[PDB]
Amino acid sequence: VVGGTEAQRNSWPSQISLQYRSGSSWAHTCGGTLIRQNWVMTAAHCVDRELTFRVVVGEHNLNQNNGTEQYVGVQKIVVHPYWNTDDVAAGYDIALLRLAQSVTLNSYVQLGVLPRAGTILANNSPCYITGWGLTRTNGQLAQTLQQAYLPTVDYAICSSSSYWGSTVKNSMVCAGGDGVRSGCQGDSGGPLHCLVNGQYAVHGVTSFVSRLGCNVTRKPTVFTRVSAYISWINNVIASN
Ligand code: NA
């Protein structure tokens, strides 16, 4: 997250870190949201690679023991069947991960609340992106969980020629685009939390940014719109 601030450690308890085994170690690769005790939602493009993955919940500092982490293997990966890896702009950038064990809930580990199907945010709605992603274009991962305030940009504006044009689809949410704050590599898969009727909900799964860089004016971060996939998600979970 570029232009973010450190999150409080009990602010975003559904945020997870998706890690892959990198020699003797594990490395953060993207974010996600805990949606059941044994299921995680992330971006499809985060699990394109044939790697060994684990989820970490209750994580705040990637490089320090917080005393709150639970580490769980990924047992099954269900990518959206219409996902096409060389076509992120087509959409369907969403995947569900079944965890080897169910995690235990506490003030650091909670289920993400999903919006109701079909819900669309008004232009300029207050939202936060969270993650451990790069803190500058071509920079390095954050140590501690970051948050940035990224007001939504509605489809009409986002899909205009000076923004994203036809690349953005109705099944996406855009947010930010001020040139200062944005998503960045390593934030993919993580949540966009938007305050609606007094309650944060996860409206977006971080999907892409410009190739011109993370924080670029009129290129708001693009998220998979979670409210477009509620049926898909429930169907997956029910059939597994
Ligand atoms: Na930690």
Curated annotation (Swiss-Prot):
Record-annotated membrane-spanning stretches: none
Which InterPro entries does the record match to this protein? Answer: Peptidase_S1_Elastase_sf, Peptidase_S1_PA, Peptidase_S1_PA_chymotrypsin, Peptidase_S1A, Trypsin_dom, TRYPSIN_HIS, TRYPSIN_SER
Task: Alphabetically list the UniProt keywords.
Answer: Calcium, Disulfide bond, Hydrolase, Metal-binding, Protease, Secreted, Serine protease, Signal, Zymogen
The reaction(s) this protein catalyses: Hydrolysis of proteins, including elastin. Preferential cleavage: Ala-|-Xaa
Q: Is Hydrolase among this UniProt entry's keywords?
A: yes
Start and end of every Peptidase S1 domain?
1-238
Q: What cofactor is this protein dependent on?
A: Ca(2+)
Q: Please, which domain of life does this record's source organism belong to?
A: Eukaryota
- Cysteine pairs bridged by disulfides in the record: 30-46, 127-194, 158-174, 184-214
Coiled-coil boundaries: none
Q: Name one Pfam family in it.
A: Trypsin
Cofactor binding, per record: Binds 1 Ca(2+) ion per subunit.
> Which molecular-function annotation in GO is an example for this chain?
metal ion binding
Q: Which residues does Ca(2+) bind? A: 59, 61, 64, 69
User: GO biological process annotations for this chain's record?
Assistant: proteolysis
A GO term from the CC aspect: extracellular space
Q: What is its main location?
A: secreted
CDD domains from the entry? Answer: Tryp_SPc (cd00190)
Q: Which body tissues produce this protein? A: Pancreas. Basal layers of the epidermis, hair follicle and sebaceous gland epithelia (at protein level).
> Under which EC number(s) is this enzyme classified?
3.4.21.36
Active site residues per record: 45 (charge relay system), 93 (charge relay system), 188 (charge relay system)
Any idea where this protein resides?
Secreted
What family does the database annotate?
A: Belongs to the peptidase S1 family. Elastase subfamily.
Described purpose of this protein according to its UniProt entry? Serine proteases that hydrolyze many proteins in addition to elastin.
Q: Which PANTHER family match?
A: CHYMOTRYPSIN-LIKE ELASTASE FAMILY MEMBER (PTHR24257), CHYMOTRYPSIN-LIKE ELASTASE FAMILY MEMBER 1 (PTHR24257:SF0)
What is this protein identified as? Chymotrypsin-like elastase family member 1
Q: Which organism is this entry from? A: Sus scrofa
